[PDB]
Amino acid sequence: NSRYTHFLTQHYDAKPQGRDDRYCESIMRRRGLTSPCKDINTFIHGNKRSIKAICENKNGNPHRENLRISKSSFQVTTCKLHGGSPWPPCQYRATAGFRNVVVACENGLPIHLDQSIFRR
Numbered sequence: 001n002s003r004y005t006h007f008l009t010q011h012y013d014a015k016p017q018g019r020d021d022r023y024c025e026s027i028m029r030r031r032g033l034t035s036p037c038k039d040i041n042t043f044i045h046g047n048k049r050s051i052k053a054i055c056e057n058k059n060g061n062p063h064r065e066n067l068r069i070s071k072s073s074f075q076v077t078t079c080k081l082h083g084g085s086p087w088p089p090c091q092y093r094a095t096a097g098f099r100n101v102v103v104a105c106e107n108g109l110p111i112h113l114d115q116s117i118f119r120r
Contacts, residue, residue: 003111007103011113012051013043016077024079024092037081037090042118044101045075055105063102067114070100078118 009031017023028034033041044051053059054070063069076099079092095118102114 003106004109007110007113008048011042011044011110012048013045013077014047016043016045019077019094019096021092021094023077024094025090028079028090028092034088034090036086037088038079039081040078040115040119042076042078042101042113042115044113045077050074051101051103051110052108054101054103055108055110060105067102067104069102073099074101076101076118 010033013027016027027043028038028041050059050070050072051074054068059071060068061071076097078095078097080095081090082093083091097118102117103110104112104114
């Protein structure tokens with residue numbers, strides 16, 4: 001139920017506009033991720049079907065401890081906090097990318113994005 005919805009709020013944007021620093025600064029604000037400033041956050045683009053499918057054999061393999069890694073590659077955008085303060089205004093540097101993603105699934109739905117793969 002709610003955790004999947006929460007996943008989409010935090011990590012899904014179907015048809016993003018641009019994907020530059022200002023894109024991150026705005027979407028991080030819209031999705032309620034700036035109080036306090038989330039240090040790093042990645043959005044997956046495209047359709048939802050392909051993301052849920054990572055939870056099945058259709059588009060995923062088991063990964064590490066109870067995670068799943070997608071077979072297909074996704075357009076993504078990683079927003080990384082810069083500046084000193086933990087509180088707003090939150091300034092973000094955007095990094096667009098294209099590769100597979102790691103999630104945790106529950107009852108066939110993604111409920112966690114593993115952010116470790118988008119650092120550095």
